[PDB]
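Lecture notes, structural biology module. Today: joint structure prediction for complexes of four components.
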Amino acid sequence: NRTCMAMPYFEIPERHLEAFKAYCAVFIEKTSKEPGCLYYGFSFNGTQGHCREVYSDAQGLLNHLVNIAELNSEAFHLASIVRYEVHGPREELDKLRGPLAFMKPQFFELEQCFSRPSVVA
Amino acid sequence: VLFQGPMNRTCMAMPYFEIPERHLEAFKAYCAVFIEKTSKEPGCLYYGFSFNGTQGHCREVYSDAQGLLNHLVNIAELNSEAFHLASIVRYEVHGPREELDKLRGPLAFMKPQFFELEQCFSRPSVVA
Amino acid sequence: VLFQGPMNRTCMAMPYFEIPERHLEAFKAYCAVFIEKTSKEPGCLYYGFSFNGTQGHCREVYSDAQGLLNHLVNIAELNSEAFHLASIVRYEVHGPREELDKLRGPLAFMKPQFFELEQCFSRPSVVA
Amino acid sequence: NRTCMAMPYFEIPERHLEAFKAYCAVFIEKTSKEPGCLYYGFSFNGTQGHCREVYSDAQGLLNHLVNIAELNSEAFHLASIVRYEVHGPREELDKLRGPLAFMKPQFFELEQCFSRPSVVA
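The predicted structure, tokenised, for the full assembly:
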């Protein structure tokens, strides 16, 4: 199981919350074209935003960053990413520590796990 | 084009642990005990521990809010005996509003950060 | 593949009228009066009358539940004077649960059939 | 404005309600491929189901019936259609009275209307 999970946390000014949520549907449409993306969901604690992103492997996360780059530049003025976590097995995170350094990610290496045959992450 | 519909009932809990270095290996050993206990819960879909050095984390995925409540009851005794190895510094709960409404009362003692899931894409054969 | 997200706030009201034949042409004339009055409501997106012989119908589309309540206030006086031309035999209200919750109290006197909108596809440029 | 609106009403046994709602997502996926379908939404009054279907013209409704026929036969045992209304201008409903007779439709001819430039139905 090489699945990796990325989690950006967003600080959204209250005047930008509705525009941010409208863009979420655009990010979801664009990300839905990625074969390696298994899950992409936006959740909110008031003005604190969050995305739970599941990719089939490290390459999937790298594909997503390239795929989403143009949308990122369009919407980058609506919020600040205040934290970025990447969770997965060490052998996949090893492929990401170099490429992702610009995000200052917090890397969590998955070491012990239970899961049902239906649910990979 | 726009697609709209109800979210899955799935809820995810994420405690973040501050583990003293002198307790880190004992904490990791106990993780096997917590996994074994949780693996018998019908409502638990995923339960896994990850580490950023001495920062620990558990990703807990339940089929609905009731699954998370069942876990709280199941693990209460174990939580109280491994209590001393770490402290929980953040506790997040993610899920749809209607399920999180069932959790705000029972989990108040954890002072959780509740994130209401509002928009999602998924491949349902592999992730809920 | 599965897409999930919130419904539009749009609400639709549909009264069905039983119109005596002797009143049908007068009813149709008054429809112009009701359309003119309703056309000044900011919250009204669509308001149209259709007929299956002497069975009349209005399709009323509002941007949210508040729009429907504003219409009730706006039309109250007109409703009371054209009151005698027909009877309402069915009154349906369609929309998302959170908006319909705002209507169950104010519209109780109409004994409405409330249909909660749960899944939808749409082309947002032309239909809400 | 040639738009027509179709409205099936469903009586769903309580034991079939969840399966019916799961099929709704399949009907929505299939109907989303129709260029002439502008809106397709399912609503529920307990066990009473309803679809609000908006088509750009009478041909769109006929295309939908053909497009959805295979799914109809798969799911036809989950509920009964107890009423079927078709609303639109007379000139479009004239094209449907023959083809749709098997549904025993209730035809409502739209005669007077207000709408904002953004909303066709």
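Point to remember: The helical segments of chain C are 24-38, 65-81, 97-100.
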